[PDB]
Design a protein around this nucleic acid. Structure first.
Lengths: 82, 144, 17, 96, 133, 231
RNA sequence: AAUC
RNA sequence: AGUAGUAACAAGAG
RNA sequence: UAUACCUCUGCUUCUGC
C-alpha cells in the first residue's frame, strides 16, 4: 500500500493529478500494447494517436466482420465528436 | 560547517560580488601558493593544462574521440533521460521530489512562460530552453 | 573413500633412492 | 588492477625498490573548484564544434555560481517550561 | 532440464588458478544484438506497432512463425512474454572468475564447478554445440 | 515570396500537415519554402482523390450520407501513425507490407498507391520509382505540363482525372504571374547546422565564472586553445 | 579459434 | 527517566 | 469555542553522483 501520510498534508491534490495521468496512460496502453514494452515515439498529440488507431481498428473489424452495423455507426459517431 | 570549511581553504583567493545574483563570491584559482600542509583550493590553471597536455601526448587523439562519442549521443538522448534519477530539487515548490515529477512540473511551468523545446523530443532544445528561461523577466508557475 | 579420509588424496609423486 | 600491479611490479629496475603508497585525499570536494573543471572541458572539446564547446561549458558555469540551501534550521528549547520550536534558516539572525 | 539430466563427477582438492574472463551467463535460443531482437519480439507480440520493416524480419522469419504458434493459446500478459523472449534472445555477458569452462551451460553452474582450493567435475545434460566441442 | 504565396493558395489543413511532416525530418519550413511546396502540392493531389469518393454497404464506388471513404490518406499524417495504418491494412487483407512508406490505399482494389509530383517528363519519373517497388504499389505520377503516367490497372475515373490536371496548371499559372515559379525550378539543399546559442543572463554568469587574470570568457577560451604551458 |  | 550522542525521539495532525 | 473517550497518520517535515 502507498504511504498514507500525504492524506493529512495539503499535498493531497497530487493524488488526483496522479490518478488523472494514470487513466490517460492506462487508456493509451489499451490502444498501444507495445507502449509497456518499448518507449512510444512521436512529437504529435497523445489524443491524435489514440483517435487514428481506434478509427482503423473499428473500420477493419467492420470490413472483416468482427464489428456490426449497429456498433460501427455508434463508433464513428463517438469518434466524430473528437 | 562545510560552507565555512569550503571558504576556509579559499579565503586567501579573490573575493568579489556577483553582478547577476548579488551574492558574495570567492575565487581561489590562480591564487597565491600555500606555505603550510592545510587543505588548499589554490590550483594554478597552467599546471592543470600542462598535465592535460601530457595526457593527450601519452594517449593520442582521445579527447576529440571521446567528445565525438558524447556529442553524437547527446543528439540521440531524449528528454525522458532526466526521469531515471533520484530525489531532485523542484524550484517551483522549493522541496525535493521524484525526478519524473520534478521534470513534469518544469515542463508544465515552461509551457506558461512559452518554452516548448521539451515537446520536440530531444534534450538539446530542452537544455536550450533552460539557459533561455534565465532571460525571461518573470517566470509564472501553477500553485494549486 | 570419503573426502575426509587421508587415503582419498591421490598417490602423489614420491622420491626413491 | 591485477594486470596494472603485475606490470607496475615486473617493469621496475632490477636491484632497486618498488614502493606502493596506500593513499587517500582529505577534503576532496571542499577544495576542487568548478573553474578548473571549466578549463578541463574547453581543452577536451578543442577540435569539436563551437555549439558543443558552449554546451559542456554550462554545467561548470552553473556550479561556479551555485547557492547552498541550509536544510531545516536549528531547534531551541526551554528545559524548565518543556517546549521546543524549529528556527527557519531565514530567521537564523532573528535571535541574538 | 540441464541440471535434471546432468551427471556429477568427483571433487578434487588442490590449487586452481582462476582467470577473470568476460563470459555469457545464460544459454540463448538464438543470439542477436539488442536492436535486432527487440524487432523480432515486436513482430511476435505487437505486429501493428512494430514500424519500419527491416531485413532482420526475413532473416529470423522462421523463429517469429515458431514463437507465435507456441505463444498462441496463453492468457499471460504480453509484457511478461516480451521479457521472457528478451531473455532467450539478448545476450547476458559479464566478467566472472573461471577455470577450464567458458560455455554458458557451465557458467550458469560456475558456483558448483570450482573454488580457489577445490574443483568439481560436472556434465551438464541436454545438448552441446559442435563449435564448443 | 513563396512564404506569403502558400497562405493564399492552400488551406490550413494542408499547410499544418506539410510543416508537421518537415518538423519530423528536422527541415525548416521558412528557410526552405520550395521544399514545403513540393509536399503541399503532393498532399493536395492525394486529398482530392479521397474527398468525393465513398463506399456503400454492398461495397462499390460512388460520389457524394456515408461514414466510410473508399481511399485511405496515409501521406500527411505523422510517421508512427502512418506505419500503424500501413501494417494494419496489409495484415488484415493478408498481403506483404511494402519496404518503403505509401501515400494511399484503395479498399476496392486492395492494393497500395504511390503518388509522385515531377517538373519535366512524367514518363521518366514513373520508370525511376518502378526500380525500387517493382510490384509492391500501383504508381500514379502527375506533372504540371498536363502530362500523366498512371498504373496498368487504372482505377482512377475520367471525371476525377480532370480535377487533378485542372488544379496542377492553375497553381503553375499563379506562380509564373508573381515571378515565384523560378524559386521551385532552382535547386534547394542547405546543411541543418545544430543551433545552440547562449542568451544574455547565462553568458553574464560564464563571464564571472573564470579564473583570476581574465576580463571575460572569450579571454579564457582563446588562452586554453592558443598558449603552451609546458614547464 | 577470438570479437560480440 | 531512558534511548541515545554534536541532535533528536520520549507521538503528530484535523 | 464545540463536535473530539471522536477521526486520520507510522519513510512523504527535504535521503544526492
Amino acid at each position: 500500500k502507498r504511504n498514507r501520510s500525504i492524506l493529512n498534508t495539503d499535498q493531497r491534490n497530487m493524488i488526483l493529478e496522479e490518478q488523472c495521468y494514470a487513466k490517460c496512460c492506462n487508456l493509451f496502453e489499451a490502444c498501444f500494447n507495445s507502449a509497456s514494452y518499448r518507449k512510444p515515439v512521436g512529437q504529435h498529440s497523445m489524443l491524435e494517436a489514440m483517435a487514428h488507431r481506434l478509427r482503423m481498428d473499428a473500420r477493419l473489424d467492420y470490413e472483416s466482420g468482427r464489428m456490426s452495423k449497429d456498433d460501427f455507426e455508434k463508433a464513428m459517431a463517438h469518434l466524430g465528436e473528437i | 560547517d562545510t560552507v565555512i570549511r569550503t571558504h576556509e581553504y579559499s579565503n586567501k583567493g579573490k573575493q568579489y560580488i556577483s553582478d547577476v545574483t548579488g551574492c558574495t563570491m570567492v575565487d581561489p584559482t590562480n591564487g597565491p601558493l600555500p606555505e603550510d600542509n592545510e587543505p588548499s583550493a589554490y590550483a594554478q590553471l597552467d599546471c592543470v593544462l600542462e598535465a592535460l597536455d601530457r595526457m593527450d601526448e601519452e594517449h593520442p587523439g582521445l579527447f576529440q574521440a571521446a567528445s565525438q562519442n558524447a556529442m553524437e549521443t547527446l543528439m540521440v538522448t531524449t528528454v525522458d533521460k532526466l526521469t531515471q534519477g533520484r530525489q531532485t530539487f523542484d524550484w517551483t515548490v522549493c522541496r525535493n521530489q521524484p525526478a519524473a515529477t520534478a521534470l513534469n512540473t518544469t515542463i508544465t511551468s515552461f509551457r506558461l512562460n512559452d518554452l516548448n523545446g521539451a515537446d520536440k523530443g530531444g534534450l538539446i532544445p530542452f537544455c536550450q530552453d533552460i539557459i533561455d528561461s534565465l532571460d525571461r523577466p518573470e517566470m509564472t508557475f501553477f500553485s494549486v | 573413500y570419503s573426502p575426509t579420509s587421508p587415503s582419498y588424496s591421490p598417490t602423489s609423486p614420491s622420491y626413491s633412492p | 588492477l591485477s594486470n596494472a600491479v603485475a606490470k607496475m611490479l615486473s617493469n621496475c629496475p632490477p636491484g632497486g625498490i618498488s614502493m606502493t603508497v596506500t593513499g587517500d585525499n582529505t577534503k576532496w570536494n571542499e577544495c576542487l573548484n568548478p573553474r578548473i573543471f571549466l578549463a578541463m572541458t574547453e581543452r577536451i572539446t578543442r577540435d569539436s564544434p563551437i555549439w558543443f564547446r558552449d554546451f559542456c561549458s554550462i554545467a561548470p558555469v552553473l556550479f561556479s555560481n551555485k547557492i547552498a540551501r541550509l536544510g531545516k534550521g536549528f531547534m531551541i528549547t526551554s528545559k524548565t517550561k518543556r517546549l521546543k520550536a524549529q528556527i527557519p534558516c531565514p530567521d537564523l539572525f532573528s535571535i541574538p | 532440464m540441464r541440471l535434471d539430466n546432468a551427471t556429477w563427477g568427483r571433487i578434487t582438492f588442490g590449487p586452481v588458478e582462476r582467470v577473470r574472463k568476460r563470459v555469457l551467463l545464460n544459454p540463448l535460443t538464438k543470439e542477436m544484438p539488442p536492436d535486432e531482437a527487440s524487432n523480432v519480439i515486436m513482430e511476435i507480440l505487437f505486429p501493428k506497432e512494430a514500424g519500419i520493416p527491416r531485413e532482420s524480419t526475413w532473416i529470423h522469419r522462421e523463429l517469429i512463425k515458431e514463437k507465435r504458434e507456441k505463444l498462441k493459446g496463453t492468457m499471460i500478459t504480453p509484457i511478461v512474454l516480451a521479457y521472457m523472449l528478451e531473455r532467450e534472445l539478448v545476450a547476458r555477458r559479464r566478467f566472472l572468475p573461471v577455470a577450464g569452462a567458458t560455455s554458458a551451460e557451465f557458467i550458469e553452474m560456475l558456483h558448483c564447478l570450482q573454488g580457489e582450493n577445490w574443483r568439481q567435475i560436472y556434465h551438464p545434460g541436454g545438448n552441446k554445440l559442435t563449435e564448443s566441442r | 515570396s513563396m512564404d506569403t504565396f502558400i497562405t493564399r493558395n492552400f488551406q490550413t489543413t494542408i499547410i499544418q500537415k506539410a510543416k508537421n511532416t518537415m518538423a519530423e525530418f528536422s527541415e525548416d519550413p521558412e528557410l526552405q519554402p520550395a521544399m514545403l511546396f513540393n509536399i503541399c502540392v503532393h498532399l493536395e493531389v492525394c486529398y482530392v482523390i479521397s474527398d468525393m469518393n465513398f463506399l456503400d454497404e454492398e461495397g462499390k464506388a460512388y460520389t457524394a450520407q456515408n461514414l466510410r471513404p473508399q481511399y485511405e490518406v496515409i501521406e500527411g499524417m505523422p510517421r508512427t501513425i502512418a506505419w500503424m495504418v500501413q501494417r494494419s491494412l496489409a495484415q488484415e487483407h493478408g498481403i506483404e507490407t511494402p519496404k518503403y512508406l505509401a501515400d494511399l490505399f484503395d479498399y476496392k482494389t486492395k492494393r497500395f498507391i504511390e503518388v509522385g509530383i515531377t517538373k519535366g517528363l512524367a514518363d521518366d519519373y514513373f520508370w525511376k520509382k518502378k526500380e525500387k517497388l517493382g510490384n509492391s504499389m500501383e504508381l500514379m505520377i502527375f506533372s504540371y505540363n498536363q502530362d500523366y503516367s498512371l498504373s496498368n490497372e487504372s482505377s482512377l475515373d475520367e471525371e476525377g482525372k480532370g480535377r487533378v490536371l485542372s488544379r496542377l496548371t492553375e497553381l503553375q499559372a499563379e506562380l509564373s504571374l508573381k515571378n515565384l515559379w523560378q524559386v521551385l525550378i532552382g535547386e534547394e539543399d542547405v546543411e541543418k547546422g545544430i543551433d545552440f546559442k547562449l542568451g544574455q543572463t547565462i553568458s553574464r554568469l560564464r563571464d564571472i565564472s573564470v579564473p583570476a587574470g581574465f576580463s571575460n570568457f572569450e579571454g579564457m577560451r582563446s588562452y586554453i586553445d592558443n598558449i603552451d604551458p609546458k614547464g
